[PDB]
Amino acid sequence: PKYTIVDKETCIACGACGAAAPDIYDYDEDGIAYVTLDDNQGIVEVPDILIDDMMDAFEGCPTDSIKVADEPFDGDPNKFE
């Protein structure tokens, strides 16, 4: 299974991830990216049909703020860092 989350401290709100994977990433009230699947908690398995879009967003994030793992983040974008 794959999980994903945005590090809100490092996101620079550059527009890339919503363009790459709009069914995974959008922008909060402040304009900062977040994962819509689970409100940035890193607890909903990414649907099969969205995995390729996830990969595009992951590689295309300039600050490496988008995280991907085989394990839930449960609210901590830095669980694996």
**Which residues of 1-81 form beta strands (DSSP E)?**
3-6, 25-27, 33-35, 66-69
Is 31:72 a contact under the CB 8 Å cutoff? no
Question: Whole-angstrom Cα distance, residue 26 to residue 11?
Answer: 12
The residue from 3, 61, 73, 77 that contacts ligand SF4 (CB under 6 A) is: 61
The residue from 22, 63, 71, 75 that contacts ligand SF4 (CB under 6 A) is: 63
Question: Whole-angstrom Cα distance, residue 1 to residue 31?
Answer: 28
| Min dist. Cβ of residue 36 to ligand SF4 (A) | 12
Question: Whole-angstrom Cα distance, residue 35 to residue 69?
Answer: 14
User: Does 21 sit near ligand SF4 (CB under 6 A)?
Assistant: no
User: Does 5 sit near ligand SF4 (CB under 6 A)?
Assistant: no
Question: Which residues are documented as binding site for [4Fe-4S] cluster?
Answer: 11, 14, 17, 61
Q: Which residues bind ligand SF4 (CB under 6 A)?
A: 6, 11-14, 16-17, 25, 33, 61-63, 65-66
